């Protein structure tokens, strides 16, 4: 009964939420607040720079796993050939490559934990970690230990409860910010407009990702999906910061506020959107594969003509997928422009796509397991 396994996915979120308040050994917890630029609702939880930063054992979340996942996916796709041999193999392919990723996150956590603990000081005086080089390393260990469990949960809660655990853990972090509504009571006046606009963007995203290119294959349709997701904006954020790595020591044009910076920004959304989805979904691969086991696209010759067909299909299709994702990135500043708002809060962006995305993904997965007890039975 899905319900009795549902109890387990709320229980796994209960342990994730209870670990939110386990503090890092090196915090002076007073300074973690009053770094608060707003009211929090957390201990070890801040509102500053539009950020919910919760510095705790889970401070960096499953996030180091996702970055190791995208790096190894880029890594196997040439660069290193050793992962390419794992890529085409299978079973074994997911096994050793996810095992390598697993060890790549845990090493990436140590450096992300280190970087987060030092730069958090420059925010608060020059002060308040612990007794300041030996004692960082316990804070690289304890924070890496935070992701390690949080990684353990994901692969426990996917094989026990509802849909894939890493996606529901990320979804748990984004939605857990309900105090954002409390903090913003603050500033009936135009609130009707804000609530209509959050329902307007949740309908805009739901019309877009649930939309499907039918490509018939010979009552079996191979969907070209969605009009290609989050990995565009994260990719996009990288190049501005690298030429901007020059900031700390050796600038204004890369400023993300300025219109030289939104055009450089918006150009990179499109490129990283396009490229990633030129690869991630339906390159030459889905053509050369139809020839191995399968049929054809009706009326279209298999082989090169199929790869030319799906490529032209992809190109024209991807433009609207791309321009849709740039606009979900720049929406918060417009929402924050006419805003009733501080620069504290989630309203309008990639935070929402994951929230609506994991909601649909976990809703469709429930029912896939729920199809035993409806219309399995017959002739009676």
């Amino acid at each position, epitope marked *: 009964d899905i319900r009795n396994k549902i109890i387990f996915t709320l229980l796994m979120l209960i342990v994730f939420r209870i670990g939110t308040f386990i503090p890092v050994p090196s915090v002076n917890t*007073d300074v973690l607040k009053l770094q608060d630029q707003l009211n929090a609702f957390g*201990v070890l939880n801040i509102f500053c720079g539009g950020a919910l930063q919760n510095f705790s054992i889970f401070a960096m979340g499953v996030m180091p796993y996702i970055t190791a996942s995208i790096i190894v996916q880029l890594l196997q796709m040439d660069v290193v050939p050793k992962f390419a041999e794992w890529s085409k193999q299978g079973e074994m392919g997911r096994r050793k490559l996810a095992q390598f990723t697993r060890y790549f996150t845990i090493v990436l956590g140590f450096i992300q934990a280190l970087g987060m603990s030092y730069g958090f000081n420059n925010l608060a005086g020059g002060m308040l970690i612990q007794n300041p080089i030996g004692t960082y390393l316990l804070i690289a260990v304890v924070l890496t230990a935070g992701t390690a469990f949080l990684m353990w949960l994901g692969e426990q809660i996917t094989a026990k409860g509802v849909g894939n655990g890493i996606s529901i853990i990320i979804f748990a972090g984004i939605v857990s910010g309900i105090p954002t509504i409390l903090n913003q009571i603050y500033a009936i006046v135009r609130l009707l407009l804000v609530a209509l606009a959050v329902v307007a963007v949740i309908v805009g995203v739901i019309y877009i990702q649930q939309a499907f290119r039918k490509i018939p294959i010979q009552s079996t349709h191979l969907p070209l999906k969605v009009n290609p997701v989050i990995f565009a904006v994260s990719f996009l954020i990288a190049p501005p910061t690298i030429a901007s790595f020059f900031g700390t020591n050796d600038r204004r044009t890369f400023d993300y506020t300025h219109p030289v910076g939104m055009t450089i920004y918006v150009v990179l959304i499109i490129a990283f959107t396009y490229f990633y989805a030129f690869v991630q979904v339906n390159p030459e691969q889905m053509a050369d594969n139809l020839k191995k086991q399968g049929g054809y696209i009706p009326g279209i010759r298999p082989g090169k003509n199929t790869q030319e067909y799906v490529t032209r299909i992809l190109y024209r299709l991807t433009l609207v997928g791309s321009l849709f994702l740039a606009f979900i990135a720049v929406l918060p500043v417009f929402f924050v422009n006419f805003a009733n708002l501080p620069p504290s809060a989630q309203i309008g962006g990639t935070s929402l796509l994951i929230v609506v995305g994991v909601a649909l993904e976990t809703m469709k997965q429930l029912e896939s397991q729920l199809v035993k007890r409806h219309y399995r039975g017959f002739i009676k």
Partner: nanobody
Amino acid sequence: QVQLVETGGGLVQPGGSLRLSCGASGSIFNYAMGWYRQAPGKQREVVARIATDDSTMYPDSVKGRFTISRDNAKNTVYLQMNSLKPEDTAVYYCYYQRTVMSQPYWGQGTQVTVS
């Protein structure tokens, strides 16, 4: 649990000194203790922090010029401010925590102006 009322602020020329006094009429203090400023155009930084062990921490900007100390019986913490500079101009707030039993408790601040 308690209330914090602080005093000892005022106007002084650079190089002068002052002593901030933070009283608690309800008195426990027997914790983690600090002073933070928050000038306008703002955000606050912790000026001094004294631990339950009586460990003492200051930021680099303040180092050696300020001294934090705690008076038993009547609940009071003292921020001794020496060699004041125009950068020190701000309202000064006294806060208490138990450390991880959570949140700091503010106080209505004392204005400090170095002219």
